[PDB]
Every structure is written in structure tokens, then in C-alpha cells.
Design a protein around this ligand. Structure first.
Ligand SMILES: [Ca+2]
Ligand SMILES: [Ca+2]
Ligand SMILES: [Ca+2]
Ligand SMILES: [Ca+2]
Ligand SMILES: [Ca+2]
Length: 318
């Protein structure tokens, strides 16, 4: 079902590759093309093996060397590609929190689109790497029901997918109806519990039943009932329940649709999903936005940065 755009290389030789990277950086100047051509053709696991061989052969750190040779968005792109898979999400999260300011956009995006299984691994990796508890960190940098919704999600305790209970579907749809449209003000607590803990298959049925009952799609009520970060979060949650690929395909579009480009988001989504469901994200992009992701990046980016991006994403038609 799910498909990424990057797979393991067949005739992989970590040692051979490491020598190619060395030659590509040794001397005056850099062969950015040889770097990008090699790294976007190997799985993340293979990139770790290459960095390992590089160290044993030359006693130098591959990532630190590249950080010295490359610059701009390209460096940032390659540096993200080198980040171990099980650590990247935790890395993005730690950096959205840290500092004096917080990047709620990143928090919302990662916590809402990642499955409980992924949330549990991210929490582990986060703790072992930065010696801090993710929840404790988020709580400290957030507040209100936004913080609450995040904590609920961080529990990775979503109900399992079982046979759907129609009466329960009716009960939940009517409950949401009463907590929002029929209420003076909003009962955010009810939205948080239902959206945050019910199984995926169940909620999909609740979304349809709620539409039949209120004449509104749950998304419209959310926009009518809430505001700020909580609104964005809840929209993200509903979107992902419907389809993670589609929700991610949407945050990419808005990262480019604007005049400039949100390189941080573009890099993050493409890299983080390259070996998960990036192929699915591509289809959903064309289906919902008329253009392929390829052509969209092709015109919003440039340099080796643009080249690496298109090689990872690929597919001119979707
Ligand atoms: Ca050099
Ligand atoms: Ca640099
Ligand atoms: Ca209301
Ligand atoms: Ca609003
Ligand atoms: Ca643009």
C-alpha cells in the first residue's frame, strides 16, 4: 500500500562509495554533483554504512566534512539526508521546541501525522539523544487545549481498529454535534477525547455520519468553532485520519504555493517520508492540485538543491 521513492541500492559497496565521496571533496572546490548523485540513490541505512566506511578509511567524519564543503539549502538538504531515520523526527521536534521560540507548525505536523507506533519510537529516540522527555518538553513550551491535544496524541494510545459499532458511530457524531454547533461556545474537551483516542476506521465513519447529521463536514465546524493553534492541530488530525499522504501532500503545496518557498518544510517532508509513503504523497498531490510534485519543485527551487530534491522525489507526471 504505502510506498516511498527511495530504496536500498542493489550493488551497494559502502567502501567504494566512501572513496567517491572523498575524491569529491578532496582538494580545492567540491564536486556537489557527485555527492548529490550518490546520496540520493542510496537508502538511509546505506548512507549510515557509507559514513562508517568513510571514518574507518580516512579517519574523518563524513557529515562534518560536507558541512564544511557545502552551504545554503543544499547543505541543509544533504545534512538531513544523512540523519538516521529513527532520529530525524526527534531531531526536528527538538529543534522546534528549543530556543526562546517554538515552531508549532512542526509540532502540529509531526505529532498529528505520525502513527502511535512512530510516536513511541520518536519518544524513545528523543530521550536517549537529548536526555529529556518529549512530553515534558512540549508541555513546557505550550499551553491551553493545544498543549492538551498534543499530550493526548503523545500518549500513542489511540484505540485499535476493530469491527465498527454503528450505535457508537451515531453516539460520537451526535456528541460532537452537541459539543460544537449546538453549544454556546465549545466543549473542546469532548473534541479532544473523541478525535484523539478513537480508532481511525471508527472516526472515518463518524466524519461521514456527522456530515449527514449537521450538513457540515467536521472540518467546517472546526473552523467555525475554534481558532489559533488548536484549530490548525485539529484540522491536521482530521486530515491525517482521512489520509496521511493527502495531508502531507497538502502541507507541501502550501510550502511552495506562496511567493517564496518554505524550504524547511519542503526538506523535512520529502526527506522524512522518502522511504515511507512519498510515492503516495505524489499521487495525492497531482489528484488534488492538478500538477505533479516534480514540476512544482522544479519551478520553486534551484541549484544542486533543486537537483537533489527532484532526484529524491522524481516522477514527472506525478
Ligand atoms: Ca575541498
Ligand atoms: Ca557551510
Ligand atoms: Ca459553538
Ligand atoms: Ca477559525
Ligand atoms: Ca513559489
Amino acid at each position: 500500500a504505502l510506498r516511498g521513492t527511495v530504496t536500498d541500492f542493489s550493488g551497494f559497496d559502502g567502501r567504494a562509495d566512501a572513496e567517491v565521496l572523498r575524491k569529491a571533496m578532496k582538494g580545492l572546490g567540491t564536486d556537489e554533483d557527485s555527492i548529490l548523485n550518490l546520496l540520493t540513490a542510496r537508502s538511509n541505512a546505506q548512507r549510515q554504512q557509507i559514513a562508517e566506511e568513510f571514518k574507518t578509511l580516512f579517519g574523518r567524519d563524513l557529515v562534518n566534512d560536507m558541512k564544511s564543503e557545502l552551504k545554503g539549502k543544499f547543505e541543509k538538504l544533504i545534512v538531513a539526508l544523512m540523519k538516521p531515520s529513527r532520529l530525524y523526527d526527534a531531531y526536528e521536534l527538538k529543534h522546534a521546541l528549543k530556543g526562546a521560540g517554538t515552531d508549532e507548525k512542526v509540532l502540529t505536523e509531526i505529532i498529528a501525522s505520525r502513527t502511535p507506533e512512530e510516536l513511541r519510537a520518536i519518544k524513545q529516540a528523543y530521550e536517549e539523544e537529548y536526555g529529556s522527555n518529549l512530553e515534558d518538553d512540549v508541555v513546557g513550551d505550550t499551553s491551553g487545549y493545544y498543549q492538551r491535544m498534543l499530550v493526548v496524541l503523545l500518549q500513542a494510545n489511540r484505540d485499535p481498529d476493530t469491527a465498527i459499532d454503528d450505535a457508537q458511530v451515531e453516539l460520537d457524531a451526535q456528541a460532537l454535534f452537541q459539543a460544537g454547533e449546538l453549544k454556546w461556545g465549545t466543549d473542546e474537551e469532548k473534541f479532544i477525547t473523541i478525535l484523539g483516542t478513537r480508532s481511525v476506521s471508527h472516526l472515518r465513519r463518524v466524519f461521514d455520519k456527522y456530515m449527514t447529521i449537521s450538513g457540515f463536514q467536521i472540518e467546517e465546524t472546526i473552523d467555525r468553532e475554534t481558532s489559533g493553534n488548536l484549530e490548525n492541530l485539529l484540522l491536521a488530525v482530521v486530515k491525517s485520519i482521512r489520509s496521511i499522504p493527502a495531508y502531507l501532500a497538502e502541507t507541501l503545496y502550501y510550502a511552495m504555493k506562496g511567493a517564496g518557498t518554505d524550504d524547511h518544510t519542503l526538506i523535512r517532508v520529502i526527506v522524512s517520508r522518502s522511504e515511507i509513503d512519498l510515492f503516495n504523497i505524489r499521487k495525492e498531490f497531482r489528484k488534488n492540485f492538478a500538477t505533479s510534485l516534480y514540476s512544482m519543485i522544479k519551478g520553486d527551487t534551484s541549484g544542486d538543491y533543486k537537483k537533489a530534491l527532484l532526484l529524491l522525489c522524481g516522477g514527472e507526471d506525478d
